[PDB]
């Protein structure tokens, strides 16, 4: 189909390592973005079939979405905050490189990104 398998959400052979920063990323950053009225297009992989988007995965080579990030945090996939932040940034980048500037999805990503950056600025030590 037009859709790939979703990204992996478990990190093979990685020891469990909980940190205040990772707790914050899940319970503050992800949770705040997840509840936002504009989160819904980003809560699961882009479904190019159900959305009739034959060009999406032609253009987006590194898919990412907040459902994947959420599961990665829940599964302790990330070794540190920067790895999780990188996935959020990839999700926003994909939106901005595929969709035409000004489209509703872009304004929604912009709103979520502003909230993201505000929360990341208060990452615990």
């Amino acid at each position: 189909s037009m859709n790939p398998p979703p990204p992996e959400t478990s990190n093979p052979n990685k020891p469990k390592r909980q940190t205040n920063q990772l707790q914050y990323l899940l319970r503050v950053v992800l949770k705040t973005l997840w509840k936002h009225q504009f989160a819904w297009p980003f809560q699961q992989p882009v479904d190019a079939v159900k959305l009739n988007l034959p060009d999406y995965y032609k253009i987006i080579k590194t898919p990412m979405d907040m459902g994947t990030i959420k599961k990665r945090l829940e599964n302790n996939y990330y070794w540190n905050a920067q790895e999780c932040i990188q996935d959020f940034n990839t999700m926003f980048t994909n939106c901005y490189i595929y969709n035409k500037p000004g489209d509703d999805i872009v304004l929604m990503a912009e709103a979520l990104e502003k909230l993201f950056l505000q929360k990341i600025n208060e990452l615990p030590t």
């Binding site: 988007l53 034959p54 969709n99 489209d103 929604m108």
Partner: peptide, 10 residues
């Protein structure tokens, strides 16, 4: 691109 259309954000 094809685009995703309106998302009813007013």
């Amino acid at each position: 691109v094809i685009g995703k259309g309106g998302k009813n954000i007013k």
